[PDB]
Amino acid sequence: HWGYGKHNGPEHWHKDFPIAKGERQSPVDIDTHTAKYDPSLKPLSVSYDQATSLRILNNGHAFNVEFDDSQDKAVLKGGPLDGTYRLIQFHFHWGSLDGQGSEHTVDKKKYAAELHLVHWNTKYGDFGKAVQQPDGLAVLGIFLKVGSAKPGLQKVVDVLDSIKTKGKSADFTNFDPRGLLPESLDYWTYPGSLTTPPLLECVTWIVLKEPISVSSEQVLKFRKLNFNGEGEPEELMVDNWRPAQPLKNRQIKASFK
Numbered sequence: 001h002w003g004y005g006k007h008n009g010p011e012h013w014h015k016d017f018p019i020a021k022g023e024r025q026s027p028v029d030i031d032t033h034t035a036k037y038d039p040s041l042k043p044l045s046v047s048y049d050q051a052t053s054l055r056i057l058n059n060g061h062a063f064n065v066e067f068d069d070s071q072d073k074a075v076l077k078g079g080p081l082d083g084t085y086r087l088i089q090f091h092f093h094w095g096s097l098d099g100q101g102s103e104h105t106v107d108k109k110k111y112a113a114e115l116h117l118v119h120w121n122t123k124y125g126d127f128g129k130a131v132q133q134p135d136g137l138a139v140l141g142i143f144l145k146v147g148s149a150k151p152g153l154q155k156v157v158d159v160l161d162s163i164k165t166k167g168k169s170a171d172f173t174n175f176d177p178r179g180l181l182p183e184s185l186d187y188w189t190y191p192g193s194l195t196t197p198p199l200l201e202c203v204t205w206i207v208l209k210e211p212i213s214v215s216s217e218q219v220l221k222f223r224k225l226n227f228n229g230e231g232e233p234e235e236l237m238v239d240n241w242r243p244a245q246p247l248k249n250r251q252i253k254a255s256f257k
């Protein structure tokens, strides 16, 4: 099955998921000089005051912080979006070293990590139906750089020891994702895909310009996770990022001047 190695990594995914070579794949490089300011874009509305996290999961590819998405409790709206998109989970992608890890790049710059807050369009009723639609998901992507610690991330880092290996979960209630957001909500947006199989072309991407800062210690704890299951040969969970894919016939739009 797919993963991030030599033998099963991104460069192989097309064999089981031919949409890997599609017209609207993600991530992409954001060429800041060619992304045009679009005055018709709105401010993003991130409403996470009632978000109800339930659990954290090592799925063997990353870890997921999961939310109760059975009511409109944590929603993303506005920005480039029509309608209302409910938060279901967040996760990250990161590197073996601070010089890589992000999926999107900015003028070819790779950040140490990238956070993805995944939301589904309520007009499709559930996640599984939403991923079948071109406007089914909105993913908010936030870059991480290494510097000052992010106090709001620490709760997540400290639970990771309990989900070291693939298939482990742990209760993770009352975590507030507002603590992961940067000051500005300036963004780039473009139409794209999931960045892991099945790579479905169902995402409006909203990538924030301003990274968050996390400490070296925090990211080092991400890198102590394992791709393998309990008791199997240890292979550190690092470099779980898909590289930039061809932009093809897409425009990246900027919310800011």
Ligand SMILES: O=C(O)Cc1cccc([N+](=O)[O-])c1
Binding pocket: 116, 118, 139, 193, 194, 195, 196, 197, 198
């Ligand atoms: O489980 C998976 O890898 C598929 C999946 C599910 C939800 C979000 C995703 N994304 O690319 O942001 C991908």
Ligand SMILES: [Zn+2]
Binding pocket: 091, 092, 093, 116, 195
């Ligand atoms: Zn992701």
